[PDB]
Amino acid sequence: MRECISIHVGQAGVQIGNACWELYCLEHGIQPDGQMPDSFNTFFSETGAGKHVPRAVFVDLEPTVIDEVRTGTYRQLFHPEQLITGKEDAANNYARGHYTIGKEIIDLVLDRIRKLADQCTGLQGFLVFHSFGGGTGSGFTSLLMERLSVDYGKKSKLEFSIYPAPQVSTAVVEPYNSILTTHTTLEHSDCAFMVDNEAIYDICRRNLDIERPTYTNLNRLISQIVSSITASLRFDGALNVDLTEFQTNLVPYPRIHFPLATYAPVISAEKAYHEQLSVAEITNACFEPANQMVKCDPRHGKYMACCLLYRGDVVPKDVNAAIATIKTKRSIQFVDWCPTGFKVGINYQPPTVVPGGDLAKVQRAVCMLSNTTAIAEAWARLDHKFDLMYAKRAFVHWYVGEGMEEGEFSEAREDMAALEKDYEEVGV
Amino acid sequence: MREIVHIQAGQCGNQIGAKFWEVISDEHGIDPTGSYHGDSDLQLERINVYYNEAAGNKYVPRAILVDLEPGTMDSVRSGPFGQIFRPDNFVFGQSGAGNNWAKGHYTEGAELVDSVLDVVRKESESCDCLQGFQLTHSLGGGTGSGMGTLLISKIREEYPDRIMNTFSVVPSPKVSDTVVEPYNATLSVHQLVENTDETYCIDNEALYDICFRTLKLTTPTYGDLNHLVSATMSGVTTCLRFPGQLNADLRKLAVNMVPFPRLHFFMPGFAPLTSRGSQQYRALTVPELTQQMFDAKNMMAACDPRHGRYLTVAAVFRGRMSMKEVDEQMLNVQNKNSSYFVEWIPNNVKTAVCDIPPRGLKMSATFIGNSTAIQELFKRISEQFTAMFRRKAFLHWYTGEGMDEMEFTEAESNMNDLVSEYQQYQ
Amino acid sequence: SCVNIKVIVRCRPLNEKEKNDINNEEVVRINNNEVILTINRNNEIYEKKYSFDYACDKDVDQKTLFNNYIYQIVDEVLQGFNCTLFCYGQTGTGKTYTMEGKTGLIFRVTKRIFDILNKRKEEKIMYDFNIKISYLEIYNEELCDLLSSMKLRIYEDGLNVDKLEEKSINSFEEIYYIICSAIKKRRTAETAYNKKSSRSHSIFTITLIIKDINNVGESITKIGKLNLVDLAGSENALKSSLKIRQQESCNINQSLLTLGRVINSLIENSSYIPYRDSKLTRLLQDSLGGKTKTFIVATISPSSLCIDETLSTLDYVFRAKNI
Ligand SMILES: Nc1nc2c(ncn2[C@@H]2O[C@H](COP(=O)(O)CP(=O)(O)OP(=O)(O)O)[C@@H](O)[C@H]2O)c(=O)[nH]1
Ligand SMILES: Nc1nc2c(ncn2[C@@H]2O[C@H](COP(=O)(O)OP(=O)(O)OP(=O)(O)O)[C@@H](O)[C@H]2O)c(=O)[nH]1
Ligand SMILES: [Mg+2]
Ligand SMILES: [Mg+2]
């Protein structure tokens, strides 16, 4: 029918992946051993009677990330050919990830990807997971993206990726990796979903009532976004919206390709005993700055466009009414460019909840994808951090020693600047 | 994968190393006999980082013991785990270096290094994927200083693509030993600055003071001093063998610690620390580790971080904690103590989280600080040195071994420039 | 005379391959003190601007360049001032010949110096002129004095090298033939660009002992310490695409990075500390703000074909003024 192949690059890439696969498995009822005591083929190819296998490639220059996958319960689900490692990590170094170590891994990886693609016909695109602050998640993924843009070209190049938070950081060369990553991202991706970290923790403590969130809490929320985006791939809706239709209805101008996103309702199971989760309430919740998974604030800019995906027990007339209500909320502005800016889809299948999760099971939910000028703030924060490091060439020697030219930092900076400029100009 | 070769040198080195191997052997489920009888498959999944797998499921330390005083080798062999060390890797001479760097660099040491280096080659060639060499020694003397310097120089030249990670004991400004302490230290530091990629400045005075005041030991011995050192060494190489929520190897550590390649000198530390009596009052959570970890009183340096500011710090947390708690506390630390960090770095804290705590703890943390206060260590050494060199005190003991006077001039100059550079960031 | 840093870019005529290629379109326009490079990247047209003291276009030859600045450098050095000049430039420029010729930098300089010295000794009548020379090159971070036909330790009493040879020169011809022999000793890297690419930084030193043996000043000895340093150009890993590549990526690119930090620091008057970052820097520490005239020269071609390289070159070089 239609299908996607997932690519998981870096530790976070892989663990987000593991979480996403747990959710996908749960949604269809596949067991860890590949048995299922249809649209399931959008991800899990039947391989033989009694056995189904998810289409994915997992990569990290460090043996450990994948060993964690290989030794998990899903060791009986994934085919061994899907798990690739190096021997030494990228050490949070873009240049090492792209020019030094990724130099050999890339051939191993492209082989597997080509083999997965050759085994199917509905391929619509690839879903790649990575982080702008990493090594493998920057350098290696940049290498891979370039190569895939040649091997496939026309297939959708969709990605989910973590951007450095306002305050939360894990490393100190993190600002370099992010500027460099963007340079590649801009010329090879079709649609990149921006993901924060700090914002998500803030969601976890306020919306899910979690005092101490872990990486699995962050991943369950990410997984909900991923499930909803592909919900139309996998399940019938009232208003079916294709993955390529999203892209068609996403970009107002060729250089604009970084949607922001949220999900609602995000309520704890305890709050679920009282919350009046109407179509309108969920819809309204999705426009509050407090609930975005990207630390930005839409009240300081305009929406270039907005697309709402409703899932579960929703009625198109109520949905239309809810949106019509939103249209009167003057606090929400749209670019003058798009008087017909709202788009909407309705999937019959509600999202599911991963066991052990805090997120309440609900009868209705909305996944909101949006395109806004507010994204510039994320970029501005990065530029300020980058310039301090860049100006004194701190840690530059670590990249130069891997074969990176100094000029690459300069050019990537200018491309970053151009990126912000474009999103500012299209604000009219 | 990412194998480590451990080269111990000098009595300080060999004793610290003896305790290091005692500790990591327990961590990997290895009995005093060398056989594996552990708790978890994890212990075996990465046992090869430090041990050579052998018939009988014997795990043999991938390590070499070194001195010119043969009793040293037997002393190591006399302890528990001493029978695990490969019988062949006890490499020694019959002289002592006489507490003289030149003797251990230009003369007797030269003969010993060629023998040792060949042993090093065999252990290194036997690896599939060598991460680096861990070296343990002191600046205070002949073998650890002279042999250390000559051997590490040759090793780096033969293995330029591997990490040269040195843990070393630096002399006290007050608790001295030899009459030539500053000569031996200065002459080694001179080359240390070019040969080592990563240096941990373990301060014997501070080490004592931690044991005396923090652990409140009545009569601490070198064994107790070594306990804390072992905690640091074993603490640094954690995620390599103990995976978790946020992993990191030594290359990653180095990448995020030294912005200006010359400044590769760090001040080690470890938390939690407690007296036995104080155990009843511990708030065993992330804030406990945080507040103890950044408490200058627990820094294993005679340097006091409050003196200046940090260029870069890092911590590897281990055990039962959320990532949010770690991130929250680290942000709170930088805000609370913003006056103590260099403004050029947009985030002065590098983190990693291991899901396996040290045995006996609910959680712990390894702390590494690239502090500007390190200039106090080297400044004090320089003052001790110039006082002697200006009078040519004991010069006859070194020039008598063939050293040029120019070698002292160069060594002094490197140390003074090293100090000036650290001060540059204050 | 003292370390004022003057900077020149020499745009070259295109070579035959550059002219034959479809990408022979020139995109560089040079005005006297500025370079405008048309950015056609993504067809976004910009007047990318760089600034120079000597923005020399493709029409400028060796004699003109000599008169534009080298002439001036030589004359100040010979008054008793030091000078450190270094060169940078693109692959394919032939800078490895431009630096010497037979007329390139070293020989044009040598001819000017000896003509001057010959006239000056006539005026004094010698002038006790005596030139010391050395070719102190750096290969895989090792020193290599190509003057000699090993253990080249750097020490500073006074900065010098253990067993460094200092040949004493009386004439252009002595240097000419010494160079002819010395260039045969250049060691190389096998690169995709050139199977015999030089793989070193090279410090040619011309040190003139000057004694002002006039009726007054015979006791005054000044030294015309002129360093003509050929920096290895940055390597694009693709042009070397191996063990040496890594060695030289470090030795060349990290050294260049370092020199960058040094120059920037010098400009920022946040100097000295960087003098110790590399042996190259240490060897050239005399240039870092002292009574040493300084000069930076780089050679580029204008074709579209070499623009990414040009931009990297201009970036490195432009920061000589712009940090
Ligand atoms: N922290 C520790 N420091 C020690 C230990 N043993 C010695 N030392 C310190 O190291 C210095 C003495 O160094 P050594 O016995 O190692 C000299 P080495 O045997 O390496 O060479 P020789 O000159 O041939 O004896 C001095 O500062 C001691 O106070 C120890 O177990 N722990
Ligand atoms: N959301 C979530 N948070 C995590 C996860 N693991 C770590 N993080 C975030 O994801 C990144 C963790 O970085 P790493 O995976 O170590 O980076 P990497 O690409 O693996 O870099 P190298 O392994 O050095 O190549 C940071 O941006 C963290 O904030 C995860 O599974 N997802
Ligand atoms: Mg990794
Ligand atoms: Mg001894």
Author numbering:
A (entry chain A): 1 to 37, 47 to 437
B (entry chain B): 1 to 426
C (entry chain K): 18 to 119, 155 to 177, 184 to 207, 212 to 219, 226 to 309, 313 to 394
Give verbatim excerpts from the published study on this entry.
In the absence of nucleotide or in saturating AMPPNP conditions, PfK5ΔL6-MD-SNAP had a comparatively high kMTlanding and a low koff, showing that when no nucleotide is present, or in its ATP-bound state, PfK5ΔL6-MD-SNAP has high MT affinity. We calculated 3D reconstructions of PfK5ΔL6-MD bound to MTs in the absence of nucleotide and in an ATP-like state, using AMPPNP. In the absence of bound nucleotide, density for all three NBS loops is visible in PfK5ΔL6-MD, although density for the P-loop in the no nucleotide state is poorly defined. In the no nucleotide state, density corresponding to loop9 and the P-loop is well separated, while density is observed connecting loop9 and 11. These configurations create an “open” NBS primed for ATP binding formed by a cavity between these three loops. Docking of a model of no nucleotide MT-bound kinesin-1 (33) into PfK5ΔL6-MD density reveals that the kinesin-1 switch loops fit poorly compared with the PfK5ΔL6-MD model, highlighting variations in the “open” NBS conformation between kinesins. In the PfK5ΔL6-MD no nucleotide reconstruction, no density is observed extending from helixα6, indicating that the neck linker is disordered in this nucleotide state. Interestingly, βlobe1/loop2 forms an interface area with α-tubulin of 181 and 145 Å2 in the no nucleotide and AMPPNP states, respectively. Density for loop5 is only well defined in the AMPPNP state and not the no nucleotide state, suggesting it is conformationally sensitive to bound nucleotide, as also observed with HsK5 loop5 (48).
